[PDB]
Amino acid sequence: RSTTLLALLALVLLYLVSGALVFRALEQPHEQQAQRELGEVREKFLRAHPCVSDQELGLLIKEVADALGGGADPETSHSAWDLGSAFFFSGTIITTIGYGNVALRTDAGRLFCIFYALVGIPLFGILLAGVGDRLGSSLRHGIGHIEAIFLKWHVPPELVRVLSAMLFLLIGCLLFVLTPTFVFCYMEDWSKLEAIYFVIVTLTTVGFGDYVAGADPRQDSPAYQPLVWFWILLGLPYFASVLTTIGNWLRVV
Amino acid sequence: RSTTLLALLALVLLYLVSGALVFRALEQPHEQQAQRELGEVREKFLRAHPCVSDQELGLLIKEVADALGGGADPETQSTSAWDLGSAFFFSGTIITTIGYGNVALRTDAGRLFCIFYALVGIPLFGILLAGVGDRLGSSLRHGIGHIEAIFLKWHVPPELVRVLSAMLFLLIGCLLFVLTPTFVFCYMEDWSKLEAIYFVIVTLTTVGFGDYVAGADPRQDSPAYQPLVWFWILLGLPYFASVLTTIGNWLRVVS
Amino acid sequence: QIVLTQSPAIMSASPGEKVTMTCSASSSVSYMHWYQQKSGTSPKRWIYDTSKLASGVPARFSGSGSGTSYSLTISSMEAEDAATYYCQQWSNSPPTFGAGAKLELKRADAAPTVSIFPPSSEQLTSGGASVVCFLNNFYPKDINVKWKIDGSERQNGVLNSWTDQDSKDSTYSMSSTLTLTKDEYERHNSYTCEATHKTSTSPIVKSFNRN
Amino acid sequence: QIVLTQSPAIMSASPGEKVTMTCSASSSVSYMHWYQQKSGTSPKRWIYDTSKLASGVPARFSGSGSGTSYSLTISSMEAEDAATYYCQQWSNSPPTFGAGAKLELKRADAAPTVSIFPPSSEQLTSGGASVVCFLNNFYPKDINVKWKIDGSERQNGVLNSWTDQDSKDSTYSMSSTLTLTKDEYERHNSYTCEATHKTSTSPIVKSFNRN
Amino acid sequence: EVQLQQSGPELVKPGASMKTSCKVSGYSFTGYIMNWVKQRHGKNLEWIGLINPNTGYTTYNQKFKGKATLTVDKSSSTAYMELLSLTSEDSAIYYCTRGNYVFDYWGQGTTLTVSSAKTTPPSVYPLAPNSMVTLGCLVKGYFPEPVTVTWNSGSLSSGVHTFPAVLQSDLYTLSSSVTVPSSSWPSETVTCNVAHPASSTKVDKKIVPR
Amino acid sequence: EVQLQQSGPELVKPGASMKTSCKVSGYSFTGYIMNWVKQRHGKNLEWIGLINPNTGYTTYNQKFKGKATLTVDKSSSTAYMELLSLTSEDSAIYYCTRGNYVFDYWGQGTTLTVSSAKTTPPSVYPLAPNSMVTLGCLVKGYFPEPVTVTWNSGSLSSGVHTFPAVLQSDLYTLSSSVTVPSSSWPSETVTCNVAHPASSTKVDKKIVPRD
Ligand SMILES: [Ca+2]
Ligand SMILES: [Ca+2]
Ligand SMILES: [Ca+2]
Ligand SMILES: [K+]
Ligand SMILES: [K+]
Ligand SMILES: [K+]
Ligand SMILES: [K+]
Ligand SMILES: [K+]
Ligand SMILES: [K+]
Ligand SMILES: [K+]
């Protein structure tokens, strides 16, 4: 193991450095895009509004920035701390996702968050284990019946078990990865790729926060936005399994 | 236990609803004031610039907002977040499942690579964590042999003593991995003691909001100081993993 | 879609009286503006940003308020102040106005001078028959008119027209015109125009016989 | 803070010729603007937003570029185009300008008509002694003057003054003035003004002896 | 002296569209936002929309999205409003006014009448029957507005009310009252002078006792 | 026709301050940003700062932070620039120009001269010595600008260069060359006429051949 752990450590470091190189190569070209866009917006506005100095538009943007930073929303409801959104935010904590698409501004908010998470994550951890097992055994009850059909076309039962479990996660994937990707494509006006990026960033509990559904009740299907938090809950076990199976595959490594 | 899980589920919901209420109470007043301050700034600007309509200032603010949301800085008008140091660190934020996201991917290629990078990366790191966990625990366990022996020589009742060793344990971890970093970050990042603890814990829980990130500060000429902290993350996470699993057991004891 | 409520919609002040009219918003607003309109002419910006007076406006006018209630005040009513006052908001697109508050002068009560006129020969020959009633130079504006043909009331083919408060005596006047076919007119003989004003419990009635 | 560099600072074109003058920026900018200035008048907006022509500007003018490099082009030089052209930027406060590029008309080379003049008696009586050289009607503008007092060159108390390109013959002219005390002047005897022009390998020298 | 000069009143058929104009002076047209306001009768004032004359940018009250097109001619510093497929509900006074938060300067207004009615001259009928006597003129079945009533060519100007016109079967009717001492009439002549400019009608009626 | 009319040239002692004005017409003063630009000689163009005439908001080039104060009078639609503790390096042409990204309209400019020098009349010295001959006027030690140099009361105007004046130790100096056929001189008398309006000086100097 001493050899193993240092070998594994070095492997991971190499992986990180290779990741670093790929990411930099793909992302460094477009670093200044947002700056370019802000500059384009300023200069276009000055051309259009002659009674505005560059330096006056400057202060406007600083003052706007500070207000957005305080959680102001460009408006033309929308409360990210109304009970719906606040619930969802609490959900992002205990799941250890932590999108951060809305940040806490009060020192009180931060202090309570500490104890809320410290007590909340393990509790959800326990429930997740629980919900994981209940579904897993119920899925396995389903798995046996599928195994019977494979059994009745003379597939060796060890092969049938692998096939059923592979079918197991493939059913999970289609149920929880593809439906949401389609759902988000229609609902959020994202691309199929953006939606899969979101789904996976979510179910890995990375929670960048660049893409969020929001679970704030709006219109057409307002109740359905908080209902997504249940997709998260049902999805996470599936991914937990996938990650632990890749973990077992890495055990095989 | 199917009855118990429904009880557990509703307990979590109640917990989330109570969380919702506390958070709203603490956070919504300032979100509404921010909204009002944006409105005050618009109305002030209209009064000062008669050649600007309410609706045209609206689009300016929306377009500005989207650009700030893309990581644009209000302070400058000129023209690395993806320098080899920061890119390494970003890769680190993935496999740890922290995912600060204080810098976002812009390219479709970047996103697609990220998927497979994580899918392969997280379980790999999970394995190494288990590894570091065992080795760390063993090393500390070798250490506390001496400590429980001294209490036996001090004639302390033995069941008391190993709780005391673990009690010594809890303090030891906290000092080196909670309190030391908070003190470190307070000086280095110019945060408050409370901001630093918030950061540390949000980090070690792997929540990774991204409101606070160590090293991220553009001005600092200490790029290595960011990767060095990444080793703290590696050592810290097992410690916190232990704490997290154990507090679950305390909740198991209550349930 | 912010709604501004001005109540009451009509109000009266004696000269020297202090007047206060209110504009309430459906939801909070940072500043209220006010316009003065006198019949026949455009609104004039009167007070803007809640309490700023526009160029010509005399100092006896002030504005005040915050949040969801705003108020225009005249320290001492003057004759030239009789007009409609409108509040307007632009803290939210689209900008919106109150339905307006008409301010009339108060004066000594006056009974209507009532006149009835039978259809002229000239009109009858063309086949139309309009019976006209003038209720002139009365105060206050509250008044009820009734038409009776042969002692029984008629409420059909009657059109009413009121003047704005007179600029010199502050009285009101109105016309009531019963329009019939020559045939219906020639059928009956007694035509009476009956006016119920505050200035008497007992109506003012002017009449004629077609005879 | 952004520096605009215009090279070359002086350039010449015969009419009908294409002209291109460039503006490089110390760091990238979204848009470059250009001004035309002629002796005795304010700059004029010539081209703005990189390639937009101002009101009067003839179509033979265009602008182009992006990032750190911008250019003004005349498809076919005209006489009225001789002027100074300046680039300016406002993609970063404060706005900044190039040092400007002078565009002169090209013509046949011309030798300077060189003349030297001794101090006038009138000036000597007041104790000053100014020796004047007129280098007149030459092309091109590049020229070098040397002052020699009994064979030994002097570059101190020398003041040089140029005319702008003549609007008729397109030549240049300059005055060079050696200013001495009567004492320094009276010490020596031979005074020479020596002019170095493209039009000869051998300098043009005008001289006089004090006696 | 900032000033907004609107074009005169317009009368158009149901279904027709209409364009009205607002020329500014005393300030730079392009420096300030132009708005249009509708006042139906004398009741609640309605913001129609704005244009930025400098940028041509427009936004409309959702209630008028389809109805109104705002344009400007920078060179003539004139704003235009067009109203489409007109109904009797569009009959109102329309103002152009300036402002991006308060409407600080207004046009004199322009009256739009939507109507199938045709230029019709009035029938003028006398109204004949104390110290004083009241006589009248019925001026009925004319279109469009206005008429003017005077008495003895304006020798009688005190004791005179002209009532507002009212729609009687798609045409206008009003009457005018004059009060004179009963010693005066019918001792001396009292004649109302009615003018209807639209129909080039100028009519005099002597009030004769029944 | 947009127009920026600047006030007359100003001549001020070292250490004094100065205020200069720029009155607009043909557009709305308050609708557009006003800037000031310094041109010392021809090459260097320097943005001084801007004022928003509508808001009174000002920004300055760091280099002019202390030196310059921008104000406006909205009622007279006039912009002002004040320069403080003036030094020789402030002697330049100053423009007011309009724009918030390009400078699209410029004043005619105003020339500032910083000098200890007092109104001094010029010393005028003749410059006397093939088909052509060149004569000259040295016009030195005068202040302030301008002088006018003519030959034979302006009747001799072809074959003339008058050079730009050059400030040397707070006084101006220039020369004038006239070239005439040698048949003309000294056959015919040739006199340069220098006029210095500031000092009410009119001086005529005949060019006489050196004895
Ligand atoms: Ca918000
Ligand atoms: Ca919400
Ligand atoms: Ca029309
Ligand atoms: K963010
Ligand atoms: K996580
Ligand atoms: K986990
Ligand atoms: K996370
Ligand atoms: K996160
Ligand atoms: K995040
Ligand atoms: K973020």
Short mmCIF file of N, CA and C in Angstrom, two decimals, chain C residues 82-178:
data_model
loop_
_atom_site.label_atom_id
_atom_site.label_comp_id
_atom_site.label_asym_id
_atom_site.label_seq_id
_atom_site.Cartn_x
_atom_site.Cartn_y
_atom_site.Cartn_z
N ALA C 82 -58.72 76.66 -9.11
CA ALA C 82 -59.77 75.74 -9.56
C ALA C 82 -59.30 75.15 -10.88
N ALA C 83 -59.19 73.82 -10.93
CA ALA C 83 -58.64 73.02 -12.05
C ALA C 83 -58.72 71.54 -11.71
N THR C 84 -58.30 70.65 -12.61
CA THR C 84 -58.07 69.23 -12.29
C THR C 84 -56.58 69.00 -12.03
N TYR C 85 -56.24 68.30 -10.94
CA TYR C 85 -54.86 67.93 -10.54
C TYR C 85 -54.72 66.42 -10.72
N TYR C 86 -53.68 66.02 -11.46
CA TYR C 86 -53.38 64.60 -11.71
C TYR C 86 -52.02 64.25 -11.12
N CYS C 87 -51.95 63.11 -10.47
CA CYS C 87 -50.66 62.54 -10.04
C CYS C 87 -50.23 61.54 -11.09
N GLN C 88 -48.91 61.39 -11.23
CA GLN C 88 -48.29 60.42 -12.16
C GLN C 88 -46.98 59.94 -11.54
N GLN C 89 -46.62 58.71 -11.91
CA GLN C 89 -45.48 57.95 -11.37
C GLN C 89 -44.68 57.43 -12.57
N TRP C 90 -43.35 57.32 -12.41
CA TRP C 90 -42.48 56.60 -13.36
C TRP C 90 -41.32 55.97 -12.59
N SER C 91 -41.63 55.34 -11.47
CA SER C 91 -40.69 54.48 -10.71
C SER C 91 -40.76 53.04 -11.29
N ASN C 92 -41.77 52.78 -12.13
CA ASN C 92 -42.06 51.50 -12.81
C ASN C 92 -42.60 51.82 -14.19
N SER C 93 -42.00 51.32 -15.26
CA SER C 93 -42.66 51.37 -16.58
C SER C 93 -43.86 50.42 -16.53
N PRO C 94 -45.00 50.72 -17.17
CA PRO C 94 -45.20 52.01 -17.84
C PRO C 94 -45.59 53.08 -16.83
N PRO C 95 -45.32 54.37 -17.13
CA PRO C 95 -45.74 55.44 -16.23
C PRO C 95 -47.27 55.39 -16.19
N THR C 96 -47.87 55.79 -15.07
CA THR C 96 -49.35 55.79 -14.89
C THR C 96 -49.78 57.05 -14.16
N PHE C 97 -51.05 57.38 -14.33
CA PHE C 97 -51.66 58.60 -13.79
C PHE C 97 -52.82 58.18 -12.88
N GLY C 98 -53.16 59.06 -11.94
CA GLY C 98 -54.46 58.97 -11.26
C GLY C 98 -55.55 59.35 -12.23
N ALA C 99 -56.81 59.09 -11.88
CA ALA C 99 -57.97 59.46 -12.73
C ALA C 99 -58.26 60.96 -12.56
N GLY C 100 -57.52 61.67 -11.71
CA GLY C 100 -57.63 63.14 -11.59
C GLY C 100 -58.57 63.54 -10.46
N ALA C 101 -58.31 64.72 -9.87
CA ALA C 101 -59.12 65.34 -8.80
C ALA C 101 -59.51 66.74 -9.27
N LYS C 102 -60.79 66.94 -9.56
CA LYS C 102 -61.33 68.24 -10.02
C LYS C 102 -61.53 69.09 -8.77
N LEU C 103 -60.97 70.29 -8.73
CA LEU C 103 -61.15 71.25 -7.62
C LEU C 103 -61.99 72.41 -8.13
N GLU C 104 -63.21 72.55 -7.60
CA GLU C 104 -64.15 73.67 -7.93
C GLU C 104 -64.13 74.68 -6.78
N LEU C 105 -64.48 75.93 -7.08
CA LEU C 105 -64.67 77.00 -6.07
C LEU C 105 -65.97 76.76 -5.31
N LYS C 106 -65.96 76.94 -4.00
CA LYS C 106 -67.20 77.03 -3.20
C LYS C 106 -67.73 78.47 -3.28
N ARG C 107 -69.05 78.64 -3.27
CA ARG C 107 -69.72 79.97 -3.26
C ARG C 107 -71.10 79.86 -2.59
N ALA C 108 -71.78 81.00 -2.39
CA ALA C 108 -73.16 81.09 -1.85
C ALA C 108 -74.08 80.21 -2.70
N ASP C 109 -74.97 79.44 -2.07
CA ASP C 109 -75.93 78.60 -2.82
C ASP C 109 -76.73 79.54 -3.73
N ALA C 110 -77.19 79.04 -4.87
CA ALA C 110 -78.10 79.75 -5.80
C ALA C 110 -79.08 78.75 -6.41
N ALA C 111 -80.37 79.11 -6.48
CA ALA C 111 -81.41 78.32 -7.16
C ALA C 111 -81.26 78.47 -8.67
N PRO C 112 -81.58 77.40 -9.43
CA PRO C 112 -81.53 77.48 -10.89
C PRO C 112 -82.61 78.46 -11.38
N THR C 113 -82.27 79.39 -12.29
CA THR C 113 -83.31 80.13 -13.06
C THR C 113 -83.74 79.23 -14.21
N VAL C 114 -84.98 78.74 -14.15
CA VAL C 114 -85.49 77.69 -15.06
C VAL C 114 -86.40 78.34 -16.10
N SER C 115 -86.18 77.95 -17.37
CA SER C 115 -86.92 78.37 -18.58
C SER C 115 -87.28 77.13 -19.40
N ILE C 116 -88.52 77.05 -19.86
CA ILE C 116 -88.95 75.98 -20.80
C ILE C 116 -89.33 76.63 -22.13
N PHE C 117 -89.08 75.94 -23.23
CA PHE C 117 -89.30 76.45 -24.61
C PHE C 117 -89.97 75.35 -25.42
N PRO C 118 -91.15 75.63 -25.99
CA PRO C 118 -91.83 74.67 -26.86
C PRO C 118 -91.18 74.64 -28.23
N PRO C 119 -91.33 73.54 -28.99
CA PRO C 119 -90.82 73.45 -30.35
C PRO C 119 -91.23 74.67 -31.18
N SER C 120 -90.28 75.31 -31.86
CA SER C 120 -90.52 76.41 -32.83
C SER C 120 -91.29 75.85 -34.03
N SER C 121 -92.16 76.67 -34.60
CA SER C 121 -92.91 76.40 -35.85
C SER C 121 -91.99 75.79 -36.92
N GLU C 122 -90.85 76.44 -37.16
CA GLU C 122 -89.84 76.09 -38.21
C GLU C 122 -89.44 74.62 -38.09
N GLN C 123 -89.19 74.15 -36.87
CA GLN C 123 -88.74 72.77 -36.57
C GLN C 123 -89.91 71.82 -36.84
N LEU C 124 -91.11 72.18 -36.37
CA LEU C 124 -92.31 71.32 -36.51
C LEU C 124 -92.50 70.99 -37.99
N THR C 125 -92.36 71.97 -38.88
CA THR C 125 -92.64 71.81 -40.34
C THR C 125 -91.70 70.73 -40.92
N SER C 126 -90.49 70.58 -40.37
CA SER C 126 -89.51 69.54 -40.79
C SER C 126 -89.80 68.20 -40.11
N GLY C 127 -90.73 68.15 -39.13
CA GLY C 127 -91.26 66.89 -38.57
C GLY C 127 -90.63 66.52 -37.25
N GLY C 128 -89.67 67.31 -36.79
CA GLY C 128 -89.02 67.11 -35.48
C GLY C 128 -89.64 68.05 -34.47
N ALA C 129 -89.60 67.68 -33.18
CA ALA C 129 -90.15 68.49 -32.07
C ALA C 129 -89.23 68.35 -30.86
N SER C 130 -88.39 69.36 -30.62
CA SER C 130 -87.44 69.40 -29.48
C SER C 130 -87.99 70.38 -28.43
N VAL C 131 -88.27 69.89 -27.22
CA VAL C 131 -88.64 70.76 -26.08
C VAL C 131 -87.39 70.98 -25.23
N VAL C 132 -87.04 72.23 -25.00
CA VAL C 132 -85.77 72.67 -24.37
C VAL C 132 -86.05 73.31 -23.00
N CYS C 133 -85.20 72.99 -22.04
CA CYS C 133 -85.20 73.50 -20.66
C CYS C 133 -83.78 73.97 -20.31
N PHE C 134 -83.67 75.22 -19.88
CA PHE C 134 -82.46 75.86 -19.33
C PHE C 134 -82.60 75.95 -17.81
N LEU C 135 -81.75 75.26 -17.07
CA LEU C 135 -81.51 75.49 -15.62
C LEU C 135 -80.19 76.28 -15.46
N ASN C 136 -80.26 77.57 -15.19
CA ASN C 136 -79.11 78.49 -15.37
C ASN C 136 -78.66 79.10 -14.04
N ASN C 137 -77.35 79.24 -13.90
CA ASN C 137 -76.66 80.01 -12.84
C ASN C 137 -77.09 79.54 -11.44
N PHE C 138 -76.92 78.25 -11.15
CA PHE C 138 -77.21 77.63 -9.84
C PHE C 138 -75.94 77.10 -9.16
N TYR C 139 -76.01 76.90 -7.85
CA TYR C 139 -74.91 76.32 -7.04
C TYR C 139 -75.48 75.69 -5.78
N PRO C 140 -75.11 74.47 -5.37
CA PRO C 140 -74.08 73.68 -6.03
C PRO C 140 -74.52 72.91 -7.27
N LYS C 141 -73.61 72.11 -7.83
CA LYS C 141 -73.78 71.45 -9.15
C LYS C 141 -74.85 70.36 -9.03
N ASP C 142 -74.96 69.71 -7.88
CA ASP C 142 -75.97 68.64 -7.65
C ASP C 142 -77.37 69.16 -8.03
N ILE C 143 -78.01 68.52 -9.00
CA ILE C 143 -79.38 68.88 -9.47
C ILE C 143 -79.96 67.67 -10.21
N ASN C 144 -81.28 67.53 -10.15
CA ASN C 144 -82.05 66.48 -10.86
C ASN C 144 -83.10 67.19 -11.73
N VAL C 145 -83.18 66.81 -13.01
CA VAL C 145 -84.25 67.27 -13.94
C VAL C 145 -85.20 66.10 -14.26
N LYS C 146 -86.50 66.40 -14.37
CA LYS C 146 -87.56 65.46 -14.82
C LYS C 146 -88.42 66.16 -15.88
N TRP C 147 -88.83 65.39 -16.89
CA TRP C 147 -89.84 65.81 -17.90
C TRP C 147 -91.17 65.10 -17.63
N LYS C 148 -92.26 65.86 -17.74
CA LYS C 148 -93.63 65.32 -17.71
C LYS C 148 -94.40 65.81 -18.93
N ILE C 149 -95.00 64.83 -19.61
CA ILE C 149 -96.00 65.01 -20.69
C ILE C 149 -97.36 64.72 -20.05
N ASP C 150 -98.23 65.73 -20.00
CA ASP C 150 -99.61 65.60 -19.44
C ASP C 150 -99.52 64.97 -18.04
N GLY C 151 -98.54 65.39 -17.22
CA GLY C 151 -98.43 65.05 -15.79
C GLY C 151 -97.76 63.71 -15.53
N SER C 152 -97.59 62.87 -16.56
CA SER C 152 -96.86 61.58 -16.49
C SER C 152 -95.43 61.75 -17.04
N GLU C 153 -94.45 61.22 -16.30
CA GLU C 153 -93.00 61.39 -16.53
C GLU C 153 -92.61 60.72 -17.86
N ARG C 154 -91.67 61.33 -18.58
CA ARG C 154 -91.05 60.78 -19.81
C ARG C 154 -89.53 60.83 -19.65
N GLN C 155 -88.85 59.72 -19.93
CA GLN C 155 -87.39 59.57 -19.69
C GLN C 155 -86.69 59.14 -20.99
N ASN C 156 -87.33 59.36 -22.15
CA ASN C 156 -86.86 58.84 -23.46
C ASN C 156 -86.75 60.02 -24.43
N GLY C 157 -85.63 60.09 -25.16
CA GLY C 157 -85.32 61.19 -26.09
C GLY C 157 -84.93 62.45 -25.34
N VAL C 158 -84.45 62.32 -24.09
CA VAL C 158 -83.94 63.45 -23.25
C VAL C 158 -82.41 63.41 -23.28
N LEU C 159 -81.78 64.53 -23.67
CA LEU C 159 -80.31 64.71 -23.64
C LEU C 159 -79.95 65.93 -22.79
N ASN C 160 -78.99 65.73 -21.90
CA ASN C 160 -78.52 66.73 -20.92
C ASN C 160 -77.09 67.19 -21.23
N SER C 161 -76.84 68.47 -21.01
CA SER C 161 -75.56 69.16 -21.26
C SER C 161 -75.32 70.13 -20.11
N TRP C 162 -74.17 70.03 -19.45
CA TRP C 162 -73.77 70.90 -18.32
C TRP C 162 -72.64 71.82 -18.78
N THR C 163 -72.56 73.03 -18.24
CA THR C 163 -71.37 73.89 -18.41
C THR C 163 -70.38 73.58 -17.29
N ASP C 164 -69.10 73.92 -17.52
CA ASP C 164 -68.06 74.03 -16.46
C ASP C 164 -68.43 75.22 -15.56
N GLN C 165 -68.02 75.18 -14.29
CA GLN C 165 -68.23 76.30 -13.35
C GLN C 165 -67.91 77.62 -14.07
N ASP C 166 -68.82 78.59 -14.07
CA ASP C 166 -68.59 79.91 -14.70
C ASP C 166 -67.36 80.58 -14.07
N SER C 167 -66.53 81.19 -14.90
CA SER C 167 -65.25 81.80 -14.51
C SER C 167 -65.47 83.11 -13.76
N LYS C 168 -66.68 83.68 -13.75
CA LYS C 168 -66.94 85.01 -13.12
C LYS C 168 -67.87 84.91 -11.91
N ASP C 169 -68.97 84.16 -11.95
CA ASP C 169 -69.87 84.01 -10.77
C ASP C 169 -69.72 82.64 -10.11
N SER C 170 -68.93 81.72 -10.66
CA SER C 170 -68.73 80.35 -10.11
C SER C 170 -70.03 79.54 -10.07
N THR C 171 -71.03 79.88 -10.87
CA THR C 171 -72.28 79.08 -10.93
C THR C 171 -72.17 78.00 -11.99
N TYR C 172 -73.13 77.08 -12.01
CA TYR C 172 -73.28 76.04 -13.04
C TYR C 172 -74.57 76.31 -13.80
N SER C 173 -74.69 75.76 -14.99
CA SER C 173 -75.90 75.86 -15.83
C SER C 173 -76.03 74.54 -16.59
N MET C 174 -77.24 74.14 -16.95
CA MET C 174 -77.46 72.91 -17.75
C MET C 174 -78.68 73.08 -18.64
N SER C 175 -78.67 72.36 -19.75
CA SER C 175 -79.74 72.26 -20.75
C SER C 175 -80.26 70.84 -20.65
N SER C 176 -81.59 70.68 -20.63
CA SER C 176 -82.28 69.39 -20.85
C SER C 176 -83.20 69.52 -22.07
N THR C 177 -83.08 68.62 -23.06
CA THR C 177 -83.79 68.69 -24.37
C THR C 177 -84.52 67.36 -24.64
N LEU C 178 -85.84 67.39 -24.49
CA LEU C 178 -86.76 66.30 -24.89
C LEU C 178 -87.00 66.39 -26.40
#
